[PDB]
Amino acid sequence: AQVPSHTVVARSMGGKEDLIWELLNQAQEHFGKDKSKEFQLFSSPHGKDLLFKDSAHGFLKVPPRMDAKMYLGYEYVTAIRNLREGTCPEAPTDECKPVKWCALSHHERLKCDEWSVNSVGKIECVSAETTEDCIAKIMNGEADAMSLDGGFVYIAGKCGLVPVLAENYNKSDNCEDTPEAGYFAVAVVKKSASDLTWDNLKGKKSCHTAVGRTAGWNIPMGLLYNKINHCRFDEFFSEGCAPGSKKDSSLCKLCMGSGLNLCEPNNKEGYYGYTGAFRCLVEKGDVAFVKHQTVPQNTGGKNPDPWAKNLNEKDYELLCLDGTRKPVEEYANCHLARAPNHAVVTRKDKEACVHKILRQQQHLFGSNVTDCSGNFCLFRSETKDLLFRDDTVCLAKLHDRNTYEKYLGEEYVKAVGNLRKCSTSSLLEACTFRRP
Amino acid sequence: AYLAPNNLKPVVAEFYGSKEDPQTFYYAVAVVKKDSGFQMNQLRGKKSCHTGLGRSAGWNIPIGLLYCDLPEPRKPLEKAVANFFSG
Amino acid sequence: FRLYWDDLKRKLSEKLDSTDFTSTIKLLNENSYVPREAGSQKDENLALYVENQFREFKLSKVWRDQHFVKIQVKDSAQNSVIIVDKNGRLVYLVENPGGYVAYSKAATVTGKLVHANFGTKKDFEDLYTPVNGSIVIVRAGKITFAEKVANAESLNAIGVLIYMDQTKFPIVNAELSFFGHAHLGTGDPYTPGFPSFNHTQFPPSRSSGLPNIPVQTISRAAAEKLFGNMEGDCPSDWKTDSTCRMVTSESKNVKLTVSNVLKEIKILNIFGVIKGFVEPDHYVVVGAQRDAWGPGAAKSGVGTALLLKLAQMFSDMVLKDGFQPSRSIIFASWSAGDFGSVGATEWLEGYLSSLHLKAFTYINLDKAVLGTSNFKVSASPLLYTLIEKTMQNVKHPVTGQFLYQDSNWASKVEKLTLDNAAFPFLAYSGIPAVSFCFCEDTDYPYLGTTMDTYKELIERIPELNKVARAAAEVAGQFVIKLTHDVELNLDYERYNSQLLSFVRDLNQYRADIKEMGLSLQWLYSARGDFFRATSRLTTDFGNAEKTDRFVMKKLNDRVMRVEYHFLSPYVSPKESPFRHVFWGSGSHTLPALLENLKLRKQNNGAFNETLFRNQLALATWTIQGAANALSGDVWDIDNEF
Amino acid sequence: FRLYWDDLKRKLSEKLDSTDFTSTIKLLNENSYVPREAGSQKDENLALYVENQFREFKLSKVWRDQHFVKIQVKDSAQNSVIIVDKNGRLVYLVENPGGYVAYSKAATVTGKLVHANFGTKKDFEDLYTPVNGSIVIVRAGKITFAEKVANAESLNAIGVLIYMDQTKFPIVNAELSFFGHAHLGTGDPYTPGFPSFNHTQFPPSRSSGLPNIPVQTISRAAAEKLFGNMEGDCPSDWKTDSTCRMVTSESKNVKLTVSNVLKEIKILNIFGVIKGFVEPDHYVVVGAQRDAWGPGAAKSGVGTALLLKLAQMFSDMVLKDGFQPSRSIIFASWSAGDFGSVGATEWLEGYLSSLHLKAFTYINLDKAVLGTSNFKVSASPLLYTLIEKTMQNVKHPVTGQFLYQDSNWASKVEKLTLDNAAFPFLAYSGIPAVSFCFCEDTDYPYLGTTMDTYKELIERIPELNKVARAAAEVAGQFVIKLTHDVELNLDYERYNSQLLSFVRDLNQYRADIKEMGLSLQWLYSARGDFFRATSRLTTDFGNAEKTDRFVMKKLNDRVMRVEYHFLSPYVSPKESPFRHVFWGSGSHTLPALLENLKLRKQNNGAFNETLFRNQLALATWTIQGAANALSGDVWDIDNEF
Ligand SMILES: *[C@@H]1O[C@H](CO)[C@@H](O[C@@H]2O[C@H](CO)[C@@H](O)[C@H](O)[C@H]2NC(C)=O)[C@H](O)[C@H]1NC(C)=O
Ligand SMILES: *[C@@H]1O[C@H](CO)[C@@H](O[C@@H]2O[C@H](CO)[C@@H](O)[C@H](O)[C@H]2NC(C)=O)[C@H](O)[C@H]1NC(C)=O
Ligand SMILES: *[C@@H]1O[C@H](CO)[C@@H](O[C@@H]2O[C@H](CO)[C@@H](O)[C@H](O)[C@H]2NC(C)=O)[C@H](O)[C@H]1NC(C)=O
Ligand SMILES: *[C@@H]1O[C@H](CO)[C@@H](O[C@@H]2O[C@H](CO)[C@@H](O)[C@H](O)[C@H]2NC(C)=O)[C@H](O)[C@H]1NC(C)=O
Ligand SMILES: *[C@@H]1O[C@H](CO)[C@@H](O[C@@H]2O[C@H](CO)[C@@H](O)[C@H](O)[C@H]2NC(C)=O)[C@H](O)[C@H]1NC(C)=O
Ligand SMILES: *[C@@H]1O[C@H](CO)[C@@H](O)[C@H](O)[C@H]1NC(C)=O
Ligand SMILES: *[C@@H]1O[C@H](CO)[C@@H](O)[C@H](O)[C@H]1NC(C)=O
Ligand SMILES: *[C@@H]1O[C@H](CO)[C@@H](O)[C@H](O)[C@H]1NC(C)=O
Ligand SMILES: [Ca+2]
Ligand SMILES: [Ca+2]
Ligand SMILES: [Fe+3]
Secondary structure: OEEOOOEEEEEOOOOOHHHHHHHHHHHHHHHOOOOOOOOOOOOOOOOOOOOOOOOOOEEEEOOOOOOHHHHHOOHHHHHHHHHHHOOOOOOOOOOOOOEEEEEEOOOHHHHHHHHHHHOOOOEEEEEEOOHHHHHHHHHHOOOOEEEEOHHHHHHHHHHOOEEEEEEOOOOOOOOOOOOOOOEEEEEEEOOOOOOOEOOEOOOOOEEOOOOOOHHHHHHHHHHHHHHHOOOOOOOOOOOEEOOOOOOOOOOOOOOOOOOOOOOOOOOOOOOOHHHHHHHHHHHHOOEEEEEOOHHHHHOOOOOOOHHHHOOOOOOOEEOOOOOOOEOOOOOOOOOOEEEOOOEEEEOOOOHHHHHHHHHHHHHHHOOOOOOOOOOOOOOOOOOOOOOOOOOOOOEEEOOOOOOHHHHHOHHHHHHHHHOOOOOOOHHHHHHHHOOO | OOOEOOOEEEEEEEEOOOOOOOOOOEEOOOOOOOOOOOOOOOOOOOOOOOOOOOOHHHHHHHHHHOOOOOOOOOOOHHHHHHHHOOO | OOOOHHHHHHHHHHHHHHOOOHHHHHHOOOOOOOOEOOOOHHHHHHHHHHHHHHHHOOOOEEEEEEEEEEEEEEOOOOOEEEEEOOOOOOEEEEEOOOOOEEOOOOEEEEEOEEEOOOOOHHHHHOOOOOOOOOEEEEEOOOOOHHHHHHHHHHOOOOEEEEEOOOOOOOOOOOOOOEOEEOOOOOOOOOOOOOOOOOOOOOOOOOOOOOOOOOEEEOOHHHHHHHHOOEEOOOOOOOOOOOOOOOEEOOOOEEEEEEOEEEEEEEEEEEEEEEOOOOOOOOEEEEEOEOOEOOOOHHHHHHHHHHHHHHHHHHHHHHHOOOOOOOOEEEEEEEOOOOOOOHHHHHHHHHOOOOOOOOEEEEEEOOOOEOOOOOOEEEEOHHHHHHHHHHOOOOEOOOOOOEOOOOOOOOOOOOOOOOOOOHHHHHHHHOOOEEEEEEOOOOOOOOOOEOOOOHHHHHHHOOOOHHHHHHHHHHHHHHHHHHHOOOOOOOOOHHHHHHHHHHHHHHHOOHHHHHHOOOOOHHHHHHHHHHHHHHHHHHHHHHOEOOOOOHHHHHHHHHHHHHHHOOEOOOOOOOOOOOOEOOOOOOOOOHHHHHHHHHHHHHOOOOOOOHHHHHHHHHHHHHHHHHHHHHOOOOOOOOOOO | OOOOHHHHHHHHHHHHHHOOOHHHHHHOOOOOOOOEOOOOHHHHHHHHHHHHHHHHOOOOEEEEEEEEEEEEEEOOOOOEEEEEOOOOOOEEEEEOOOOOEEOOOOEEEEEOEEEOOOOOHHHHHOOOOOOOOOEEEEEOOOOOHHHHHHHHHHOOOOEEEEEOOOOOOOOOOOOOOEOEEOOOOOOOOOOOOOOOOOOOOOOOOOOOOOOOOOEEEOOHHHHHHHHOOEEOOOOOOOOOOOOOOOEEOOOOEEEEEEOEEEEEEEEEEEEEEEOOOOOOOOEEEEEOEOOEOOOOHHHHHHHHHHHHHHHHHHHHHHHOOOOOOOOEEEEEEEOOOOOOOHHHHHHHHHOOOOOOOOEEEEEEOOOOEOOOOOOEEEEOHHHHHHHHHHOOOOEOOOOOOEOOOOOOOOOOOOOOOOOOOHHHHHHHHOOOEEEEEEOOOOOOOOOOEOOOOHHHHHHHOOOOHHHHHHHHHHHHHHHHHHHOOOOOOOOOHHHHHHHHHHHHHHHOOHHHHHHOOOOOHHHHHHHHHHHHHHHHHHHHHHOOOOOOOHHHHHHHHHHHHHHHOOEOOOOOOOOOOOOEOOOOOOOOOHHHHHHHHHHHHHOOOOOOOHHHHHHHHHHHHHHHHHHHHHOOOOOOOOOOO
């Protein structure tokens, strides 16, 4: 088998990583690859393997995200725990243990608990706070499955997870088997400002869904990244709203939530997500970056919320790439770029049980269940878009396409690959450092 | 070292390749003498040398691969492995 | 060297293979011990015999305790039952029954007699005739005597006759008479909530569960002599004889005189402890009853024999074989278990603050051997996983198959009844308790009667040494598993399953709650929050050094506390003693909430609805409170974030 | 290196020497915070200010909690008081008072007015005129408002007017008006016993301590305008003015209309914790009120300033100076302490099972600075030894002498009153609590009034920085001593002295008990048995390794439990909440037993005597039960041997 390397360890709270890393940086630059004959660090005459290995040739910094369980992997910790505890697993594989779905911050956790009781017991709920933290909670092994958009199917797929079931957005008799095409991403501008074009976005305000998503981050900042060619973005925009960025920015400054919850990427941010980004546009925004399906769902009293009750769609228009304003009903003449559907990811060993359970769960509580108020609906929410997108019909079975790259596809993986030197998500840094 | 009350943390690793290509993982193998002529599966009753208790390429991989073939009682592990080899 | 689990298993099979229980059960039926009322001289002779044995086995400390209680015994004037004619001119005797019911009221009543099949509330609601101003007759079974007398008292009857008949109890003679107590709830009833020592000056206080009507047992031929004057027909839904009838004729009506006196006697509990090596503070209690109104072979002889030989095996195994238990072990022998188990309840109400959270498991050896066919277990769910492992290792006495034959054995486990001593431990003190029998499909026919003796026992069960060998082996497994290692073998996700069942049941009425203005969602979030608690603690066992001991102490205290936190903090422990929300009595428990909410849809205006709002608030915050107290500290709790 | 005790003392004097409290007390009286009712917008501004500070001091975790309570606020119609003539032809106004009493009943009453000096039971028993069907007027002092209204309700009066006069309160103007609550007991009164969250659905429930008569405060010139029509003479035993009189004239009689509405507001508690290094599970709570009806300089500004600067000193000392506390520390800031301290009582009734036996000391910073002359302390006796050591090290602010001037200071310590927040901690949850003031001989004159501000404060106390410097130094000493070392500095022989005092008092009636047929001797043996308990545990500290930690854990759990075991297990915690037998309320406590036994010799047939037998039984076995539970295990107990 392969094993991870030896590691300098130190305590967590007392520290300190930086000082050890400076000292061993000067050590590796002087003494590693025979720059000095008068002293060697990796070989010694008194004995071999002293203080370090002999076959080492240099030192690599461990990222601050990666703790020991993420360091060793999952198979190695599982094997060493079955070996300490002394259990040979038989596992005949007939029935399925209940799936531990993951939630986040008191609205997902509420809904998830209600679904845990309305199912007979096959679904149980464990909550995290941000979505990166929950993906890590799937890797080390407390949480089983999660639904998340394609920009996080890229990260979690790079960390070693597989997508199983996809979400459908189109109503059909054969929706459960047909692989859909993928939704479109647009940018919505006011009618009150008709001066906005794609050729001039500089110094004018913006609204994003969340940092790292498809329609809020990858599709905008890829096509923007060709034109600006700078990695920072709070210089190109005067100010905007993109939650999940760092607190020093103007991007977290213009956002809504309070107190201490501004720019925090959960539902406790008022401008988070699709409907929150649209509310950013309506209240304080110049351009927003959402899916194409946002405006007919927030137009005309479809929300009982007041600010969405008063609005109309013939005002709020979408702009193009060449600069020509296209009306709202035609999105296909000018979409920014396509985005793949949201998909449910899990670990590889639970793929059969997540598959068999969720196909059972979509039949009982899915889209044919009318009388939605008072009884339980799995997909209908109160436009917070929680656990699943609110307009999903069914969830498609994926055969022959279960990886991150085959699911997401070539143009999108190329797009995030163009964006890849600017992504600041620390979990991506950790899952890249694990690679040789 | 991860366990409580120790609460340690891994901070600096090390690579084994050349500087042209760093490699973080390394392999675990089992060296023997020429013409000893014995298979891996029936390796009981032989002399084994381990680099330490709990170490990676010395302990966890060989006992893990040899593990389920031993009869009950398997706990504690050192008693069972001690009865597997003849010292 | 050290000893691990499989050594202890094979050594208990070796050492338990040799001894013979049959002579000891024969010895406890000798002419020197054959009548054993509570507080009689024979009880003190067996008492000083058992204490002499515990001194002889060289236990670490043997100690004796005594109480002074008030029981109900017979007097000189015979209590009797008579057909009285409407003319009143002449009198017909039925019998002068040898049996008496404990804690009945000293009175005499005349009136008509109505058959009342089991006296269950369901069996009273389907009754044809009105029950007021009349005497009821019931047959023994399906519930305790006290719930029959309490139900017939609630429907304003004036007296209760209790018999046993051919279909349920096939016995050759129709003449034997039997015994029972009629106190709803346990304990010495003239000291509720506080113990009966000399320290408490004996104040005037009276429990609520005592009936106010005369109760009397009759024989079967006495019953048939009554059915000579009875008329009507038993329904075919009742599995009964051909001679039973419903009501009494218009002329004749019965009369029963019951005279019983209150005696004040001396209870003598006897204890013996083996110490522990790792920590001697925490301990598991193994108990057994010691006295019964008849000879008491299968009622009190079997448990006392398993107790004595079990103490000999563990004391011998610690002294010679080098077994080192991590926790201490208390053996107990209790007098007057027959009058509603007052030895256990006085010992719990006496030393509550001393064993608050120290003691962590009770095991009951009482009535272990009745039948040879089936295995029936009843426990608090923290022991369920434990029982399942034991059921896979102990071989059945008749056939060579293991006990674990059904995989859904956790669904057939039923509630701890009020007569058992595990119910005061679990329902009152909050200690996980277990009780198990090799039971037969039909009831054991002569259990509290004058016939119960070793001859009829060994005629019933043809081989006794292998069966009691097996039950002693099981009760050995529970003690060795709990005390051999640093990890307690209690399991809390079973409680999680119980919560799931409750909420599914309450979900079936969601429409009603939705239209009272109440929302049910907070209890959903309560249950799910309990799941995050137990999952967090399972991972906390995941990341700990098992050989290190201080970090296992802080986690084992949480495991021992997760039983205690289900006790309601909001009820008075003197008013309503059994305050465990899953298995208790009263209005604060969870099936009382579900029951009242059923009477909401009954719509006859018999529910309360402010009581329902209070019950949902307190039950919701009790589940939520235990869920917060399991998972971490105060600041690590998250609400609304 | 490590730090020992004297380093922590000199370092707290060095770091506490620099900072100035005067600007912060001036800042909490700014125009952005000057009215602070419960749940107003200014309270939320100060709330997010304090949470912003606790975030800025880099504490280990800062968290916010919120409740929804029901308080009593004013409405549009002015509540007023009027002399009504017997003719009724014309109406005379006294005043439209700015003050109002919380939790008074919305009503209007007419009738005669009787002076009722303090409304104490002793002051009602010596009253000349009958009190039924009439309105009483009392002067403020010596007891809480709620006990005045409860006593005058018990003697069937119909209304209460409350003022403050010249002899007790010398203030220049006679015009200012003040505030009080009249709820007997603490907590949100519409949720007794259970917390006021969203989880409990808000059921209809009403506490018992709420009065049913209108209560109103008046100014002093309003009082003198009433005394224009009054007549009689105040007795010379009353230290009062020359203008007071007794009863109202035969013609004229007063009328008061009080209109108050029940508002439902949002309480916002704010917390912040420093972790611990040895064990972070156990923690000491330091609290402070935050809102008051007037400006609240000395009522809520001083405690909040000591809280903020105290948090800055400990957080700074842990972060930079290398102090490592063995136990964690929780800082608290509580809203709506003015309406009977509902932040503390909702936080205790909310998270009772979470801090059951984890939390072990509460310290109250509230009302710390009133006077400059005297030092007055009030605590649970486990802290007494602690306080005595602190009183020998903290130098007085005016003179250079130490605080420890009297050796019999333990005899002048008086009972925790109901208005203080230490009383819900100690009486309800069973946590040892302390509260201390630099008090003056006379009362602080304008405490709940509209005048209380920084100007009148610094005019009263001419140097404030040294005084608040001293009180912050004392509250620093209590925290450093409890958390610096592995040995808790609680002391239990003080409880032993308390028991001695009780039994000496009861011994003075031994003849009466001897002739009821009761024997008093079992309580003698109870007290002496408690002495053998605490002496045994003192030797157990004698024979233990102090540097070893696991053997100190098992003993420190017993020290933390000896407070909890004095709570009666026999009363309902929802019916009568304060259930600590030494310092509680109701009929189960010890001075209630002694009081009822005094009414036995009164011989007017007003005592109960079956209640007395129950009280002696339960109090005797509670003392005995704590004494057994302190000393060792179950088997190590000896009774009758
Ligand atoms: C959404 O799904 C529907 C099927 O329900 C697709 O409908 C087809 O539409 C084309 C052109 O309008 C027709 O020729 C087909 O006959 C339809 N299929 C049927 C009726 O089964 C529709 O194209 C889908 N939309 C998108 C954007 O994919
Ligand atoms: C403890 O209480 C018991 C009550 O059972 C006392 O024993 C009884 O005392 C009365 C009065 O002298 C007599 O009937 C007998 O002496 C006892 N009765 C029985 C049935 O034994 C006892 O005196 C009390 N005190 C002690 C020290 O035991
Ligand atoms: C409904 O349940 C309540 C709760 O027990 C009861 O009504 C009142 O309960 C309080 C609390 O014990 C008592 O103080 C009152 O005396 C009860 N009301 C009356 C009128 O007695 C009662 O059991 C039920 N019925 C009604 C009508 O309230
Ligand atoms: C918790 O319960 C209270 C109800 O007392 C809610 O707070 C109030 O709700 C009522 C009903 O709409 C309104 O007066 C206000 O919305 C609230 N009053 C205030 C803040 O003074 C509160 O919304 C509930 N919380 C949840 C999550 O349902
Ligand atoms: C003597 O004390 C008792 C106190 O318990 C008074 O009330 C008794 O209360 C209990 C339970 O609350 C109930 O049995 C009855 O309400 C009362 N008991 C009896 C026997 O009446 C009792 O009223 C007091 N007696 C006097 C004369 O004040
Ligand atoms: C919709 O519901 C009906 C009844 O529940 C069911 O028979 C049918 O199969 C469902 N259809 C789908 C597509 O789930
Ligand atoms: C029972 O007693 C008599 C006799 O049947 C009857 O009149 C009465 O209504 C019944 N019910 C009650 C409650 O007394
Ligand atoms: C109550 O006061 C009235 C005066 O109106 C008096 O007549 C009566 O006697 C008083 N009540 C009692 C019980 O004395
Ligand atoms: Ca009792
Ligand atoms: Ca409350
Ligand atoms: Fe998306």
